[PDB]
């Protein structure tokens, strides 16, 4: 009851899934072979962690997850890696030829050859659920599979499961680690096509993660591994309410009610604290007040933008670890009297707080220090439209000359899809302006 199915699409989605499921296993005491000694109900149960893991009669705890990629080299490392025993082979789906950083190949040319199989395996997972709550879809904006196949899958999922909830974790492109010039094209196309089919999307700016790793962890040149371990910490903070129980634990859907005022305005800004090296953490205990203050420093955001030059429509604090409401309320009181937190006039200015008591875990041999308490803030701020603005500007610069468009037309796309998607993005920027204007 209340199961969630995770779908990891493309290289970025699959590798972030790798990090997330390793972290989940560590948080729940699940061994790489799927065994969980503390689970005394064999082959089933309705424990909180069963929202994300099903159970076999042999005692294996299996992720409710599908991994999808159009080429096999990334999922092959899952098939041969540490947690290979965790998954059933049918959960790891690969093609032979990738989408070559081409939305059109991911959505149409190559994607159409594997979409039915992927939907079949997702149906096999859904049939094991007594009360499916929805899907979590991990993907990049920039990759051919991550964009086009994700858009195809989201459309097909809307068809196969109606209004059932679909959440995204979307990797926003950054030049420091980007691999394609056309990533702005792919980003705008997939955002346009997915906008109607996603109920809530958490954007992760690779540049923001990159800078957080460099600045707070003193990693000279962060790799995908560094970025993904940090991203998995944020994802775990977000899904902890679904995977653990508690008396101060507030459900993600209850946060979502506050976070989505209009169906199109469903892009929360996530901020996470603390991100600290073990050398700095040693003998430095960060308090609830310190980490809550850190939630309002832009340098800690998942997406580069300036909330101080925008307006809030929602503010959620998701604490995990040694945290009590008295300290939370004290810190929030301090922050209000000291920070640039301006709400729109049609929304209440309160902060919604949830606390999960189970402390954060870190992957052995990682860069993050083990801390006693952490917090992820989900805020609906008009500032997130800055990311759309940057992406749309790069799009406009290339499309004014029709640069690289022939690669898409050659796969069966028309220029009208480009112009229609760009107009949808312009309307989105307009929506974010309008929601921020005061009432009359």
């Amino acid at each position: 009851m209340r199961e969630c199915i995770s779908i990891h699409v493309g290289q970025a989605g699959v590798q972030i899934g790798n990090a997330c499921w390793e972290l989940y296993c560590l948080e729940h005491g699940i061994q790489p072979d799927g065994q969980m000694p503390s689970d005394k109900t064999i082959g089933g149960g309705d424990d909180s962690f069963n929202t994300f893991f099903s159970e076999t009669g042999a005692g294996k705890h299996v992720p409710r997850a599908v991994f999808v990629d159009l080429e096999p080299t990334v999922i092959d490392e899952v098939r041969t890696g540490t947690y290979r025993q965790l998954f059933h082979p049918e959960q790891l789906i690969t093609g032979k030829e990738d989408a070559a950083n081409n939305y059109a190949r991911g959505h149409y040319t190559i994607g159409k050859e594997i979409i039915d199989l992927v939907l079949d395996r997702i149906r096999k997972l859904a049939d094991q659920c007594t009360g499916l709550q929805g899907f979590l879809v991990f993907h990049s904006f920039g990759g051919g599979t991550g964009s086009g196949f994700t858009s195809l899958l989201m459309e097909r999922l809307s068809v196969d499961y109606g209004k059932k909830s679909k959440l995204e974790f979307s990797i926003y492109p950054a030049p420091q680690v980007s691999t394609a010039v056309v990533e702005p094209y792919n980003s705008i196309l997939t955002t346009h096509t997915t906008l109607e089919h996603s109920d809530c999307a958490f954007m992760v700016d690779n540049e923001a993660i990159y800078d957080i790793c460099r600045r707070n962890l003193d990693i000279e040149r962060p790799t995908y591994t560094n970025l993904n371990r940090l991203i998995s910490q944020i994802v775990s903070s977000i899904t902890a309410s679904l995977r653990f129980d508690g008396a101060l634990n507030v459900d993600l859907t209850e946060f979502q009610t506050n976070l989505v005022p209009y169906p199109r305005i469903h892009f929360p800004l996530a901020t996470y604290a603390p991100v600290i090296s073990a050398e700095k953490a040693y003998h430095e205990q960060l308090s609830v007040a310190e980490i809550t203050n850190a939630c309002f420093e832009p340098a800690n955001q998942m997406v580069k933008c300036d909330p101080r030059h925008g307006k809030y429509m929602a503010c959620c604090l998701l604490y995990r670890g040694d945290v009590v409401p008295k300290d939370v309320n004290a810190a929030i009181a301090t922050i209000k009297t000291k920070r640039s937190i301006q709400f729109v006039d049609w929304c209440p200015t309160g902060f919604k707080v949830g606390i999960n008591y189970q402390p954060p875990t870190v992957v052995p041999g990682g860069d993050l220090a083990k801390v006693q308490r952490a917090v992820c803030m989900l805020s609906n701020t008009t500032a997130i439209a800055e990311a759309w603005a940057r992406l749309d500007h790069k799009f406009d610069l290339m499309y004014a000359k029709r640069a690289f468009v022939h690669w898409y037309v050659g796969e069966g796309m028309e220029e009208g899809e480009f112009s229609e998607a760009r107009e949808d993005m312009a309307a989105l920027e307009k929506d974010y302006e309008e929601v921020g204007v005061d009432s009359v």
Binding site: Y108, V159, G162, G410
Partner: protein, 68 residues
């Protein structure tokens, strides 16, 4: 009258969900069909140009043959 309105509200929710599913299905079918057509058209034009090249090569060898 209240009961009638309740039935109406739930029927309207069902109708809107079903119409969402229907329009999504139809838009996806239209897009995949139009895309298949466009890509096949591009490949067909490409192969037609290559066949014109073959025809021109035939013509060239003919023109050399009647030069002897």
């Amino acid at each position: 009258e209240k009961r009638e309105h309740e039935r109406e509200v739930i029927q309207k929710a069902i109708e809107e969900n079903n119409n969402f599913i229907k329009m999504a299905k139809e838009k996806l079918a239209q897009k995949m069909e139009s895309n298949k057509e466009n890509r096949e058209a591009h490949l067909a034009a490409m192969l037609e140009r290559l066949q014109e090249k073959d025809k021109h090569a035939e013509e060239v060898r003919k023109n050399k043959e009647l030069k002897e």
